[PDB]
Amino acid sequence: TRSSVLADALNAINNAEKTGKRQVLIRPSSKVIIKFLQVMQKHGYIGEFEYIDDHRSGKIVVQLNGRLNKCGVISPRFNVKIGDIEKWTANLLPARQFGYVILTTSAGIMDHEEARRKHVSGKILGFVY
Amino acid sequence: MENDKGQLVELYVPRKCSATNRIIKADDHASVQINVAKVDEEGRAIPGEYVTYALSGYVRSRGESDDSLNRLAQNDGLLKNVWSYSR
Amino acid sequence: VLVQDLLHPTAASEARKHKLKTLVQGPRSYFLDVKCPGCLNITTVFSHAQTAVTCESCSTILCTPTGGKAKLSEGTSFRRK
Amino acid sequence: PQAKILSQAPTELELQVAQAFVELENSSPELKAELRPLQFKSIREIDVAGGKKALAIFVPVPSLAGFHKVQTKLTRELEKKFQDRHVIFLAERRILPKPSRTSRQVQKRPRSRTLTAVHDKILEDLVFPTEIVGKRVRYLVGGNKIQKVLLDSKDVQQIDYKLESFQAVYNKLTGKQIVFEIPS
Amino acid sequence: NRQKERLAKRDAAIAKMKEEAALEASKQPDLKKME
Amino acid sequence: GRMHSAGKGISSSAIPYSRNAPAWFKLSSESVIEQIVKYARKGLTPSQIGVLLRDAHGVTQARVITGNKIMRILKSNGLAPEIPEDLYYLIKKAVSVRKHLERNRKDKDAKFRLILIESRIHRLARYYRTVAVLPPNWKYESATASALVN
RNA sequence: GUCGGAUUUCCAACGGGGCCUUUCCUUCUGGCUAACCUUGAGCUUGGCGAACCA
RNA sequence: UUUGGUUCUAUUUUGUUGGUUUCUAGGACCAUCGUAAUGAUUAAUAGGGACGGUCGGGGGCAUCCAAGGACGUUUUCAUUAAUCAAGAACGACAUAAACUAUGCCGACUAGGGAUCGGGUGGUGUUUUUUUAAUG
């Protein structure tokens, strides 16, 4: 059955960007999807997106730019301490100048750079470049 | 890209597709550069004055070059009622 | 098609799809208000009637159940409400 | 009297609309005793971009169906009675805060008392004679969210001049920006 | 449950006073219908 | 899903977006509540109630006409059955299949479907015990199944 | 403004705290009463307990 | 904020240490008074169940009996779910080249026509009673 809603969301983004289409439909829109797309949007990877609401769970329509290479989820959400942040960004990022690992901390969901600035850690959600 | 203080590096900054906004590789031999001449008030085109649209090999190979060319032609105003946003 | 408006599909294609495959899901059925010969007694009957619906005053059955839309009887006068 | 129509807090303008209420009560016997049992809690002034201010009349929640029965008529008399004004009836609902980890438990918070539930309720109560057919949220690239509300195309003639008034009062009350659309 | 009894009592009082003033409303004539 | 088959068919109801509904219905709430208690006094399951108000009169769902749902007001009016309808239909189907099996021994696919039916019965019994709409120590056996249909 | 070291009124960014918008983000006895409506003339006589504890 | 009754403990003192108490101080139990917007999340293109017309060289028995899928649904439940050691049923005693040599569930991604079951619509065609409803 449908276990990780965020995984299916990011898979839909990946398939739509690989095919080259500039828009994509997402079902069914948890909160962490909204925060994930906000993080990808503030870094200039996707652009504007839309929250359709039916009365069940909601749908997202995302306008896609050409700026996305790959977005991905990490399952399960491993516990990440301070040293594991740069061990992870060594592990699964393309380079040391760009690319963002997304983790949810107790002060919200954020990328690894501003998590380093806030000096907080948490559980790893996914990555985007 | 740049190093620390000036001295522009990165030889051959590559062109980017006007449809899917991906870069075009050096050996992408299916990529094309459509050159459209514009007209100035007499029905005749001026030699040397163009608008230019680069299409990558992937969108052209999928058959989606003509719909995308419709969209960028209608976006620039030289086309009137061929492409619809609402499909 | 690689660029299209998922927010505003055209009315023909959004009426074309299955009822669960639209933008928001909704029922394609409807309610009728039906008048039977004799006594007036306007009734409201759902389109897929699922049972032998009769008038409350007398046994003057209006629809018989059918696996899709239920057929209505020969003497009725119905409107879409 | 004007004091009976007012529930708790007396100021001058709610006393004026209470005088208008009892003047509409004694006249028009077809609707007399339909508007008699109801009282209203408070009045709020909203400034709009059009320049004609808005009377947000906050009423008790259980009495709201009584306003829903006669709302079109009393709103028409209230637009007539006060020039350069737009009148809206809202139900003053209670927002209970979200219980945190450190806080002691105060029963179980009902789901009608959450912030989003009462915001959706007052958004519905802004547009009473119309019915909302859909909602959307625009997440812009700057981070701002603008909520778009779709209204059913029937009987929009009552509220079509008051849409920017609805936007102003919703922006003041909730701090969120909304845009109304009529699908046709 | 004292609360449901209080709710029913206030509903009955509102309905009784509404009917009592509705009798006076039916006693009064309507100039609006004549106009 | 369809755990006891292989079908993947989707066929259900599509509830309308209008939570307050439908602006052409003129009856009151108390009229339909007295309709449900009068209809449930003569012994009908709430599914039959829902379809029978859906087609004889104009009732989209009883949830949107009243403030609450159906056996909520049945249990408030004191007409809630001692077991709910889904488990009851499952156990009555079970004793019908067991009657067939005691009549004909060699219907061996009927044995297979009997094991399927008791699997569904035990799953619903487990769910109803952990929510305590049934008391704990309640167990389904065939001898009590012959009389539990009532 | 010192002879490649250092400051301040400054445009910005980055993380913090406090207050208000329906948002108690446990309170009783005590004391310091504290930040004290406390104002004696331009440094004086008198507000609410955690900011200090029990 | 209150108003009843029951019960327990208790310092300063009342002139002292003990003994009977009252008010007070602090409990706990009981009664009906008043405060609140009195209090139950959607119904997942999750799942189960009812219902309606069907559909199948599915099964058994003899020459009727129950079950099942899909469809339709503005019907009901409410997360009851997915995969499964042990264990159990069936299997041409428990086997096979038991094969799609391809575990199950879920999501997305290019098409095209034919076919099977159902449903919707088309003043479409034909048949009945030229014509209706059907098929």
UniProtKB/Swiss-Prot annotation, chain A:
PROSITE patterns associated with the record: RIBOSOMAL_S8
Cystine bridges: none
Entry keywords, A to Z: Cytoplasm, Ribonucleoprotein, Ribosomal protein
InterPro entries for this protein: Ribosomal_uS8, Ribosomal_uS8_CS, Ribosomal_uS8_sf
The UniProt record lists the keyword Cytoplasm: yes
Principal subcellular localization: cytoplasm
Example GO BP: cytoplasmic translation
Cellular component aspect of the GO annotation: cytosol; cytosolic small ribosomal subunit
Its job: Component of the ribosome, a large ribonucleoprotein complex responsible for the synthesis of proteins in the cell. The small ribosomal subunit (SSU) binds messenger RNAs (mRNAs) and translates the encoded message by selecting cognate aminoacyl-transfer RNA (tRNA) molecules. The large subunit (LSU) contains the ribosomal catalytic site termed the peptidyl transferase center (PTC), which catalyzes the formation of peptide bonds, thereby polymerizing the amino acids delivered by tRNAs into a polypeptide chain.
Protein name: Small ribosomal subunit protein uS8A
The species this protein was found in: Saccharomyces cerevisiae (strain ATCC 204508 / S288c)
UniProtKB/Swiss-Prot annotation, chain C:
Predominant location category: cytoplasm
GO terms (BP aspect): maturation of SSU-rRNA from tricistronic rRNA transcript (SSU-rRNA, 5.8S rRNA, LSU-rRNA); ribosomal small subunit assembly; translation
Any one Gene Ontology molecular-function term assigned to this protein's record: zinc ion binding
Superkingdom field: Eukaryota
Alphabetized SUPFAM superfamilies for the sequence: Zn-binding ribosomal proteins
Maturation and modification: The N-terminus is not modified.
Family: Belongs to the eukaryotic ribosomal protein eS27 family.
Role: Component of the ribosome, a large ribonucleoprotein complex responsible for the synthesis of proteins in the cell. The small ribosomal subunit (SSU) binds messenger RNAs (mRNAs) and translates the encoded message by selecting cognate aminoacyl-transfer RNA (tRNA) molecules. The large subunit (LSU) contains the ribosomal catalytic site termed the peptidyl transferase center (PTC), which catalyzes the formation of peptide bonds, thereby polymerizing the amino acids delivered by tRNAs into a polypeptide chain.
HAMAP family linked to this entry: Ribosomal_eS27 (MF_00371)
Name recorded for this polypeptide: Small ribosomal subunit protein eS27A
Gene: RPS27A
Swiss-Prot record, chain D:
One GO cellular component term noted in the UniProt record for this chain: cytosolic small ribosomal subunit
Cross-link (Glycyl lysine isopeptide (Lys-Gly) (interchain with G-Cter in ubiquitin)): K80, K81, K121
GO MF annotation list: structural constituent of ribosome
TM spans (from-to): none
Modifications after synthesis and translation: N-terminally acetylated by acetyltransferase NatA.
Pfam families, per database record: Ribosomal_S7e (PF01251)
Keyword DNA-binding: no
Keywords assigned by UniProt, alphabetized: Acetylation, Cytoplasm, Isopeptide bond, Nucleus, Ribonucleoprotein, Ribosomal protein, Ribosome biogenesis, rRNA processing, Ubl conjugation
Cell compartment(s), UniProt: Cytoplasm; Nucleus, Nucleolus
GO biological process terms held by the UniProt record: cytoplasmic translation; ribosomal small subunit biogenesis; ribosome biogenesis; rRNA processing
Domain of life: Eukaryota
Role according to the record: Component of the ribosome, a large ribonucleoprotein complex responsible for the synthesis of proteins in the cell. The small ribosomal subunit (SSU) binds messenger RNAs (mRNAs) and translates the encoded message by selecting cognate aminoacyl-transfer RNA (tRNA) molecules. The large subunit (LSU) contains the ribosomal catalytic site termed the peptidyl transferase center (PTC), which catalyzes the formation of peptide bonds, thereby polymerizing the amino acids delivered by tRNAs into a polypeptide chain.
Family from the record: Belongs to the eukaryotic ribosomal protein eS7 family.
Miscellaneous information on this protein: Present with 41000 molecules/cell in log phase SD medium.
Descriptive protein name: Small ribosomal subunit protein eS7A
Organism: Saccharomyces cerevisiae (strain ATCC 204508 / S288c) (Baker's yeast)
Gene of this entry: RPS7A
UniProtKB/Swiss-Prot annotation, chain E:
Domain of life from the UniProt record: Eukaryota
Additional free-text comment from the UniProt record: Present with 172 molecules/cell in log phase SD medium.
Name this protein carries in UniProt: OTU domain-containing protein 2
Source organism per UniProt: Saccharomyces cerevisiae (strain ATCC 204508 / S288c)
Entire protein: shown range: 120 to 154 of 307
